[PDB]
From a paper:
The 169 rhinovirus (RV) types identified to date are a main cause of the common cold. In many RV types, a ‘pocket factor’, in most cases a myristate, was identified in a hydrophobic pocket lined by amino acid residues mainly contributed by VP1. During infection, the native virus expands and releases the pocket factor and VP4 giving rise to the ‘A particle’.
Numbering used by the authors:
A (entry chain C), B (entry chain C): 1 to 237
C (entry chain C): 1 to 60
D (entry chain B): 1 to 251
E (entry chain D), F (entry chain D): 1 to 34
G (entry chain A), H (entry chain A): 1 to 280
Write the structure that this text describes.
Amino acid sequence: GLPVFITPGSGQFLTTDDFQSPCALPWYHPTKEISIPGEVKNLVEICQVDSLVPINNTDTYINSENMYSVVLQSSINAPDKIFSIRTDVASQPLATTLIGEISSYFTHWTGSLRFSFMFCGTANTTVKLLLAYTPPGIAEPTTRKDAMLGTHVIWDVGLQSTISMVVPWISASHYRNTSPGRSTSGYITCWYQTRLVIPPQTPPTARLLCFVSGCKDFCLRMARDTNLHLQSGAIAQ
Amino acid sequence: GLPVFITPGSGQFLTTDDFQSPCALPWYHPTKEISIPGEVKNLVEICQVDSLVPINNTDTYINSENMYSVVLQSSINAPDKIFSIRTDVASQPLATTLIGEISSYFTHWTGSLRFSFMFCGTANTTVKLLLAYTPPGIAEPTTRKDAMLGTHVIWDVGLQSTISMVVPWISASHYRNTSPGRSTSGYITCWYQTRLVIPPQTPPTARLLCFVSGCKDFCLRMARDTNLHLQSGAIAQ
Amino acid sequence: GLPVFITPGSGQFLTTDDFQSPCALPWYHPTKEISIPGEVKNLVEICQVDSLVPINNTDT
Amino acid sequence: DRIIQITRGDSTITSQDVANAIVAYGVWPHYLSSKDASAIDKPSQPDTSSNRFYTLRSVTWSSSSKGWWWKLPDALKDMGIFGENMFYHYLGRSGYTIHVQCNASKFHQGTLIVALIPEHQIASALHGNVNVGYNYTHPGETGREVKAETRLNPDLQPTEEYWLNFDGTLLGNITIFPHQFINLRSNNSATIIAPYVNAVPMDSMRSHNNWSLVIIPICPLETSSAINTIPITISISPMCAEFSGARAKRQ
Amino acid sequence: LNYFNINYFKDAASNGASKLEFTQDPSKFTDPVK
Amino acid sequence: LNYFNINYFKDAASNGASKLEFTQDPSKFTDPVK
Amino acid sequence: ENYIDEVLNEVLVVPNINSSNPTTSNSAPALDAAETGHTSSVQPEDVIETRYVQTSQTRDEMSLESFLGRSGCIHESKLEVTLANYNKENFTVWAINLQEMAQIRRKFELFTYTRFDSEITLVPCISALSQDIGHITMQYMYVPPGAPVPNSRDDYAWQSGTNASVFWQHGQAYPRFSLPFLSVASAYYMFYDGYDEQDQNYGTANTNNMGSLCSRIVTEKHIHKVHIMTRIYHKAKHVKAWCPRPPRALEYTRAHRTNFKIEDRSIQTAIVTRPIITTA
Amino acid sequence: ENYIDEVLNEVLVVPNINSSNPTTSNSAPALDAAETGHTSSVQPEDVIETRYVQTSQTRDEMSLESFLGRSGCIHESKLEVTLANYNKENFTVWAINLQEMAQIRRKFELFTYTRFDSEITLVPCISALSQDIGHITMQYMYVPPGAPVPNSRDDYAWQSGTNASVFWQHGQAYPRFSLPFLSVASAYYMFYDGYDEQDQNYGTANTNNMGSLCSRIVTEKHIHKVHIMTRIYHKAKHVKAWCPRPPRALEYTRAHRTNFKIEDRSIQTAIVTRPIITTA
Ligand SMILES: CCCCCCCCCCCC(=O)O
Ligand SMILES: CCCCCCCCCCCC(=O)O
């Protein structure tokens, strides 16, 4: 006969609650747990793994393997641009990578980003390139002089065939929305530095690859529902 | 199977209750708190700040800056009255000041009040004035002799241009209603003491300003809803 | 998830009960109490005071 | 006393009759600590080449004036090294020091109100579904003056209700903001020192205005002399400025 | 005189009202100066 | 700051969510090698 | 010692009043200068003869937690069911903002920045337009920014894989839940002097974006005509604030804006005129 | 010390950022070789000049328990009662599987093996097709493999000698119960590369068989026409996982299968084309 007082919100079903409930199978003893390699404990281990990014997402190479590489020409003698993408973690074309796919389940993000490039050409072929990052608040650069005035790295190909640059975290606040709308986070571009030189009787073109992964300060919060998948009809049983 | 007894009043929704409820966002970690200047902890700090009072609230100066000042004439040689207002904290015209606006959210009040006056005239102009406060229970004075028989201060203008008088707390009970209805709390008046004297080739008029703030014994209680604001239609989204 | 058992007589309104209820005016501080002469604590003090009795209650 | 002397960079200001000085919210400006930092790159501190005094264009005070207002750091958008650094970077923060000077004779009378308002969001002039254009909130060093003649683009201009603080709040309650008075019979100068206040450690300098300066004549100017129009001058000095995120020039 | 006070949920937001502390009497508003 | 935590049922499945532990930072995924 | 004071609400004491005597000296505390932007510090025992009084009031009710810790309505949603095209209509979407009710908006707009936790309570009501109501069930789901927004009663988005949801049925008590401080910055913005990246949307319309709140009726097709009206109440906990501002004087017109002009209407405030200033 | 951190969710700290100075040496940490199948270990303080920053974020929300511990709908069953042949119809049978709702299926198929306990909640709804509903009672029974499956409303199998059952009636709250990890092996299979003993049924259609869930209406004959719709929600506790896999890119077609082809339909993914690659 203990007197009690009922508070508002009783009897409701909240999806994200945490309460204990009686079991339907008393005295049941589950199977023992053997050791299996490859146990994942946090989602941040997945985000620290490189994956290719579809740079060449035009209509011609829409469903093939040609969308992951970009071609270089040796007939060009000028400081020209090769490609340019946005650095927003959840925007195209890098929204479909591993880190992009995982980030679509949250709303806020922070930390730095790491980009890697690999050169796939003949061992007798040499080139020099320039990779630059542009902080927000200004239009996209159109000439090498404007691109140089910023965070940039100069790459020379040799015995090693991979380079890695980082995009520092530069923002007014501490977090950013994974779906920004009208705001941006900057651009990254690539330009010819000197030329692409080949010996006689050699293919006159070369390919390139790009990877992306998160640095040691990457983080996510405020989990939500992803927007990269949908169910139109009904799944057949 | 603990026996319990249900008491009356269970399941109700009381607006001013205090109960714990489950959270809808488990494991969420809010953003850190940086230091921002200007942190307010109590509402009494706002009430201890001076603000102007619209003494001249006639129809001519209804929407302008002329309602905050009163003019003095040098062509008057007589003990005349300049202005008079009521000392109720939540009545016109001092109901729209900071302390008046804050007091409209409560029902009871207590403590003393502080009034300040500033003289805005030529540096070669001199005057003497009389400020008096009349306790309740009697009609408003009409002559300087009646006004003098009370709490009053004599002001002489010089290098300093500001004077400050206080209105002591005199009441039968310990608190007063912010909306009194028929009762009153007294009056405060201003009279010419000697004259306003100017040199040759000088403007013949001068202006005055008034401020108000609470003393160290001001207090409020029994919070309610304000009556100085209303919503007629619907706010467009 | 503590299991409980409901006993008869729950939810009723008994006029002479004694239970605690939430307050509608949080953080309110009532007025102080001054000393007033003549404080009554029990009803037996009233019963120990003389009073006249209408012995002659005729119609006249 | 009435004497004051302030030296920021290579410039000095003196005055022989002032009324103390105001430190906004009782906090002195300083640099950014590592406990609150968000960006990871190294900031740039021009020091003495940018923390100096800059003077804006003067205005005329007559018997029919109504008021003026400015915005920061929009006013100093082209003042040498500070403007160049503001337009070459992406983030920045700084404090300020404001000095207002206006002198008259001993046969004049008048009073001014000088206030500094944070996050002063002004209201529109017309009714319906309208908003405020970008060009009219960034007038540069000239500032904005309340007038009566018809302006162009009525659907983008702000309001002229000076007595409503330009945003729907009664004048006379403005004393909560850091403020000072100028009485012609007492003093002729005002000084306010303000730190950096915001909800974020650092922010874009071309899309956000932290502070605003408002001048309102509460008592009309009146005199019997032949000098019936008095000028007003304003000087501003950045304190502890730093920038980050270098790129190409926005302009 | 006294009363019991126990939290039941694991989240801080889930708890009740904060305990009234101080009013920071020193007012920089009244005297905005060092 | 603190909170109560008592189990009422006799089964472990009946209890609430498990206490967050570690993330096993060493990632064999990043560097799949001894 | 600490339970007793707060149970009696005897914290936050007020200074007493000291007795005074007639004085005559060179120092004049009554005189001062108001051009310095400071408030005078004159006390009653400096200009009049006072009596020793032991004050007993306490300033607990003027604290921020007491002032802002009261529930108030912030929204009202009306849902009318139709028996034709049952699986297309019968859902509502609302964007979260505390700028549609005059009382709450004016109370909270007294400062520039704030930081607090929230508490939400729902009050559902059913209006009967037929002979009977039957069994009615309702669902409310919270959609953070970027998540898919349903556009039909039978959309797949209602499965609520990660989104939080709550259910209510006739005969049940009022639902209630709590929310933490959910913002990118360290505080909320009530006034913003800035634009977006395209130099558009002046005001707070860009910084504040907390998502949407959706609702639907879960019961299948039936033969009853009803209307559902739900009211949402909000209360703040663990409150902090900065930089107070003057109170609003006129009526609000639009959300996220400070416009006050009204077509064919003069400006009206709370000030009442007088015939003459020499008569109170 | 342990209550405080978890109440504030301050576990799982993140490393800080250290300051750096200009360098010029023979060692070049920026250069590496990606043919080794390893991830580069370059940090921001190796290629640029940084500032000392004390980070404050915590990675608690990306844990597996937080990620997978949310309720979501997995099934919807519709039961229409008929007043003719009352004792023959009016029962439903469903085979348990977590492969019929896109959100839950895609969330859980990010790994190869998992092991967890379950929690089930039911949301019953009644649709009125007549003047009144009356009194309605429902029963749900769990049938493990090998147990007799009822085929009528009045079958003897409803006596529930050993099978677990639950009852619901109008005006009652939502039922809820828990289940342990019930599998023959040490983990669940989301992908299986194998067949059965007859070299048939390729996939997971053979390893996963948890039984069936049955329901019926217990009320006897009446004169009311109603429809009953019940929704089942599931949440996982004490979760472990192994061997992560790439996320799904296309829509699902069938259960226990990975087929994606659709008649008279081109292949569509989430990638959006561009006019030219030199303009972002
Ligand atoms: C139903 C969810 C309602 C929660 C809203 C409270 C948080 C809003 C804080 C800032 C909103 C604004 O100022 O408009
Ligand atoms: C109503 C009972 C529902 C319980 C199902 C949860 C356990 C299923 C685990 C594996 C099922 C599968 O992967 O299809």
